[PDB]
């Protein structure tokens, strides 16, 4: 069912909150801009084939912008128990994370046009819980806001947080432009009264 890492993508504050009123109080354009180019990101040579994974939960889907669904150039996928006949000119769906997985697996490859070069798990509580569960979840990219914002929702589990300490390590700043690819802002950014920063953290498997 998997053979490849999964990496998480989260927006998240002080306080481990992710959401409220199933949308994102806070507008941050360059945020944004960060995720596009993560989640698109591909080597140059693998350019032309491989292409990236974007899983997400039913109400992530719908909280994405008519005008922005589906994320261009790159693969969605999203996991929902219960069929609602719509799909939408590709989009594929599945019945969970590894139902997800072999599905991809199987859709590509070798008779495959097309390949996959990474999987990202981009949202959903419940499918952040079900990610921080799965055995090839090794890499966080999380986004820190410094700011106590109101939310209903929150990231599953404390991993920046001492108890976790020993499990979940904070990665230099150089190997996480690395890993991504360009060179990413070092150090708090402001935007629309919100301070936020960039971090990468890593799981041993
Ligand atoms: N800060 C961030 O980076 C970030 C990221 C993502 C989402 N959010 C926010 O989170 C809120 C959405 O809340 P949510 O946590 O309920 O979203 P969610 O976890 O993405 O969606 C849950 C829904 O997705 C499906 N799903 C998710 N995990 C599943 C699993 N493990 N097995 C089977 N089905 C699964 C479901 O299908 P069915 O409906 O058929 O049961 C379920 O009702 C919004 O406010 C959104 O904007 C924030
Ligand atoms: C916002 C955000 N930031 C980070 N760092 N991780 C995250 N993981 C999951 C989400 C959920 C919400 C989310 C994700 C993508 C779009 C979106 O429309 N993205 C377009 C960008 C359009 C633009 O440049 O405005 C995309 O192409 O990716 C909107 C909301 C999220």
Same mark, same amino acid.
């Given at each position: 069912?998997?053979?490849?890492?999964? *990496?998480?993508?989260?927006? $998240?504050?002080?306080?481990? /909150? %992710?959401?409220?009123?199933? #949308? =994102?109080?806070?507008? +941050?354009?360059?945020?944004?801009?960060?995720?596009?180019?993560?989640?698109?990101?591909?080597?140059?040579?693998?350019?032309?084939?491989?292409?990236?994974?974007?899983?997400?939960?039913?109400?992530?889907?719908?909280?994405?912008?008519?005008?922005?669904?589906?994320?261009?150039?790159?693969?969605?996928?999203?996991? *929902?128990?219960?069929?609602? $006949?719509?799909?939408?000119? /590709? %989009?594929?769906?599945?019945? #969970? =994370?590894?139902?997800? +997985?072999?599905?991809?697996?199987?859709?590509?490859?070798?008779?495959?046009?097309?390949?996959?070069?990474?999987?990202?798990?981009?949202?959903?509580?419940?499918?952040?819980?079900?990610?921080?569960?799965?055995?090839?979840?090794?890499?966080?990219?999380?986004?820190?806001?410094?700011?106590?914002?109101?939310?209903?929702?929150?990231?599953?589990?404390?991993?920046?947080?001492?108890?976790?300490?020993?499990?979940?390590?904070?990665?230099?700043?150089?190997?996480?432009?690395?890993?991504?690819?360009?060179?990413?802002?070092?150090?708090?950014?402001?935007?629309?009264?919100?301070?936020?920063?960039?971090?990468?953290?890593?799981?041993?498997?």
């Amino acid at each position: 069912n998997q053979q490849k890492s999964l *990496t998480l993508i989260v927006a $998240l504050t002080t306080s481990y /909150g %992710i959401g409220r009123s199933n #949308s =994102l109080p806070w507008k +941050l354009k360059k945020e944004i801009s960060y995720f596009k180019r993560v989640t698109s990101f591909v080597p140059t040579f693998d350019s032309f084939e491989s292409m990236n994974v974007v899983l997400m939960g039913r109400k992530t889907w719908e909280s994405i912008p008519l005008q922005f669904r589906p994320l261009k150039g790159r693969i969605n996928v999203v996991i *929902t128990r219960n069929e609602s $006949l719509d799909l939408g000119n /590709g %989009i594929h769906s599945a019945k #969970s =994370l590894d139902h997800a +997985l072999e599905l991809l697996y199987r859709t590509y490859g070798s008779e495959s046009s097309v390949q996959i070069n990474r999987i990202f798990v981009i949202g959903g509580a419940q499918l952040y819980k079900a990610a921080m569960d799965h055995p090839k979840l090794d890499r966080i990219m999380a986004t820190i806001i410094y700011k106590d914002i109101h939310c209903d929702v929150f990231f599953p589990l404390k991993f920046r947080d001492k108890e976790w300490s020993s499990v979940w390590k904070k990665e230099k700043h150089s190997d996480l432009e690395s890993w991504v690819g360009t060179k990413v802002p070092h150090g708090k950014i402001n935007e629309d009264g919100f301070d936020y920063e960039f971090e990468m953290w890593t799981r041993d498997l």
